[PDB]
Amino acid sequence: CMERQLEAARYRSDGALLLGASSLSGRCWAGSLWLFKDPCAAPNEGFCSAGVQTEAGVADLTWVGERGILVASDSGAVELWELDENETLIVSKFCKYEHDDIVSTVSVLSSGTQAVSGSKDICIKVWDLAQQVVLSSYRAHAAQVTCVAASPHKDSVFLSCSEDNRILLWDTRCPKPASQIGCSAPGYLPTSLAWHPQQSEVFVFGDENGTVSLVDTKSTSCVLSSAVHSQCVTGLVFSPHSVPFLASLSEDCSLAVLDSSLSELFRSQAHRDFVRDATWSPLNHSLLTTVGWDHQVVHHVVP
């Protein structure tokens, strides 16, 4: 019962590497969470620091502080897994079945005490991670929720996008908490979201046609957009750098790295199936780690 489809890769503050994996084919359709204190040793199971089996697949993943792992299950559950005091084991803390279909996306809020999940049931939920209960449930979209992304510094603010062709800016302090923003007219469906690390007020969204767009929330007009990929943009991750780089992932099996004006600086074809996630090393800010359905963990050096 092994899992070869790599879904998620997230570097912890101290440089350790978190992997989420699904079996999407064969007898068992399950999933697994791994921790690699040596990042170069991955994805080889024998030289892991910790591992565990899940009941079902993992569609998305995120750190919760330093020991916590928050999982978007195929089962409809959101799961919180804690780390052992010695970080040898990975034990389940809570598994709550509150979505009616696949949970596709999760995002931790700035506080670190709350999170938001998006599902194929079209719903979005806000979670209390101490009380293990749903605070709010929102049916704002008319189709599956592709992506939810917490504002970096405001607990009440986060983005969402959906196959209903809506990008919603959320503020839970407003009686009507969602607001529709984007380009002037008919977009190709939004597929990925990334807040700017420095500017509260700006973000990027990738579309299903391969375009990457820079958006100002206030101006609600697409500043820039470039044809980066030949297929769907599945992820967008800003580097930790003072003037940050943008990494874009695609079903076209390529990594691109872009500047603030969305010009192409780097491009890797090393993957020979879809590219699912990316994290920048917090130790070496020029190191970028990608994982994909070809079970490859590639470590790129970025000029």
Binding site: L24, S25, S75, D164, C174, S230, C253
Partner: protein
């Protein structure tokens, strides 16, 4: 009881899962046949050359289990009507692949969503698969009462939900189904899986799905309220809709996760059980007709043809109908023969079409009840039934009854009748030619004689049934007009249909008919006000008859004789369905036509659009004289 399946979109181990749902009490499982999240490339390298296996093995279940227990589900990423060309082309190839795997496994049904307005390419690809070898498999189109967009929380500040009457818009989901099914040419392999939300729409939105081929109703765990004990239950309006659906013997599918944590997953199902067991049980008519729902039969012609033994047997198993004939003869005998003449005045009583004698016996029961003397002739041209009559006459009746083995239009009667009694009525009253038969027998009724029945009237009503339209369509036969099946009536216990307007009288006949100029031909125009959006597939026909004074028979639904099962309604189809909008008038025209040899019906719709004249000159359907 209830046949019901579990919906899952997550199956780690098909053995363990199927075993869990069986224990829970489910009859079948709707599940993915490829992993829902496993998008596949068919055109671009390198993803195209992804190593296999592409899904789990057919060896994991018995052929029996695939054939009976598993409904396939189309992967949610498959979007043949995407605005992106690469996603259309890839979804085309992926749809064929998933459907072809379904056929490979011999699955009884495959689920596909209608979740947007444009499903043209989806329909083209399904239609292409359907015409790739004749297979049995069903396609269940998953469509909601209410579109998600029209159900959303009113929580987008700069995009509010409209609080205004949108009559046609609230029906948008039916038009999604209608357009898909039309594109696919009304294939009998494409049915509806109707999905039901937390808040039901207006009734008119529900009534749209009357006459539609609903094989499944999908109930999400969300819509279940909670009670004192903790048990999942439904709103009284949800219970109403279930009761409607139970009469369409649909399959119930439970979808979503167990929100009633403290209670098991038997409970949800146990509620539906509780609901089906605690409905109003079947009455005498429903229990009788249970097997006949929407079964098309050609109308009997007891004049041109000799009915079988077993056909008379069902005619005679109708005690309400013969009670009414007895009472009509009882009241007639008292009006014609005064008390002080009871010993002297013997009335001449003639049964015209006596079969195996049930009216003969009702005539004797009547005379013994009214305490009046009668003389019976039993007239029957079916010489097979005449055998039954003559054994009765020698064994029990004696010389009171004279059996006459001949046509009532030829028989030289020795004396005239006080009363002629007959039962020559079809489902459309005059469609067995009672008028022509009793006309030819009139000359041997006394100048002041009574026909029982004295009067009958046919009724028509426009109906919608995409289900019966398909049943008629499938009555094509070699060596005749390809469209002949649309130009002839059927006797049917109409079940899956919508009555679009109140029945109205079509044709009336009076007996005796004293008129110097007897013409049994007829031309009638009917205007039917329709107050819904719908589709016209034909006209339901019924009749009422006066036996004597206030004693009557009726199969017109509003006045239907209670507990009488001798007659089902008749159906006049039309060749091409007709769109009818709310507010519009359906105008139909019916003719009764004749020559020496044949009687027939012709008909036409003249509004809101014209049909062809159906059955011109009796080319497809005639009733023999």
């Amino acid at each position: 009881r209830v046949s019901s399946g579990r919906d899952l979109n997550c199956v780690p181990e098909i053995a363990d899962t199927l075993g869990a749902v069986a224990k829970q009490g489910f009859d079948f499982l709707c599940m993915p046949v490829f992993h829902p999240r496993f998008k596949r490339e068919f055109i671009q390298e390198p993803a195209k050359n992804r190593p296999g296996p592409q899904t789990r093995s057919d060896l994991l279940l018995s052929g029996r289990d695939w054939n009976t227990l598993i409904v396939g589900k189309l992967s949610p990423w498959i979007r043949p009507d995407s605005k992106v060309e690469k996603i259309r082309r890839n979804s085309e190839a992926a749809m064929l692949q998933e459907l072809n795997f379904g056929a490979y496994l011999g699955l009884p049904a495959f689920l596909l969503p209608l979740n947007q307005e444009d499903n043209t390419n989806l329909a083209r690809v399904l239609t292409n698969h359907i015409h790739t070898g004749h297979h049995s498999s069903m396609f269940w189109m998953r469509v909601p009462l209410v579109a998600p967009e029209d159900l959303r929380d009113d929580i987008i500040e700069n995009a509010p939900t409209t609080h205004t009457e949108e009559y046609s818009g609230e029906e948008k989901t039916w038009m999604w189904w209608h357009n898909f099914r039309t594109l696919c040419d009304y294939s009998k392999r494409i049915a509806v899986a109707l999905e039901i939300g937390a808040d039901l729409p207006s009734n008119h939105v529900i009534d749209r799905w009357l006459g539609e081929p609903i094989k499944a109703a999908i109930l999400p765990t969300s819509i279940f309220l909670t009670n004192k004990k903790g048990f999942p239950v439904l709103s009284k309006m949800h219970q109403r809709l279930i009761f409607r659906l139970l009469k369409l013997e649909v399959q119930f599918i439970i979808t979503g996760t167990n929100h009633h944590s403290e209670k098991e997953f038997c409970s949800y199902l146990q509620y539906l059980e509780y609901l089906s067991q605690n409905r109003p049980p079947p009455n005498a008519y429903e229990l009788f007709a249970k097997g006949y729902e929407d079964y098309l039969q050609s109308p009997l012609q007891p004049l041109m043809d000799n009915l079988e033994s077993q056909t008379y047997e069902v005619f005679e198993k109708d005690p309400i109908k013969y009670s009414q004939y007895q009472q009509a003869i009882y009241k007639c005998l008292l009006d014609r023969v005064p008390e002080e003449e009871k010993d002297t005045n013997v009335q001449v009583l003639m049964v015209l079409g006596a079969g195996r004698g049930p009216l003969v016996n009702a005539s004797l029961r009547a005379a013994k009840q009214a305490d009046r003397r009668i003389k019976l002739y039993a007239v029957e041209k079916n010489p097979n039934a005449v055998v039954t009559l003559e054994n009765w006459q020698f064994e029990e009746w004696g010389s009171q009854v004279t059996v006459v083995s001949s046509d009532m239009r030829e028989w030289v009667a020795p004396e005239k009748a006080d009363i002629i009694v007959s039962e020559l009525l079809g489902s459309f009253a005059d469609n067995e030619l009672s008028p022509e038969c009793l006309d030819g027998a009139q000359h041997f009724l006394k100048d002041d004689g009574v026909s029982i029945p004295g009067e009958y009237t046919s009724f028509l009503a426009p109906i919608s049934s995409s289900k019966l339209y398909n049943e008629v369509r499938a009555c094509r036969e070699k060596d005749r007009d390809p469209e002949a099946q649309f130009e002839m009536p059927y006797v049917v216990r109409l079940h899956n249909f919508h009555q679009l307007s109140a029945p109205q009288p079509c044709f009336t006949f009076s007996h005796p008919n004293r008129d110097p100029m007897i013409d049994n031909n007829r031309y009638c125009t009917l205007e039917f006000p329709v107050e819904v959006n719908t589709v016209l597939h034909g006209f339901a026909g019924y009749f009422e008859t006066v036996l004597y004074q206030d004693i009557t028979l009726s199969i017109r639904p509003e006045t239907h004789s209670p507990g009488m099962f001798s007659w089902f309604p008749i159906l006049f189809p039309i060749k091409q369905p007709i769109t009818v909008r709310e507010g519009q008038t359906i105008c139909v025209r019916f003719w009764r036509c004749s020559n020496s040899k044949k009687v027939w019906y012709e008909w036409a719709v003249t509004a809101p659009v014209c049909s062809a004249i159906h059955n011109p000159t009796g080319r497809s359907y005639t009733i023999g004289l």
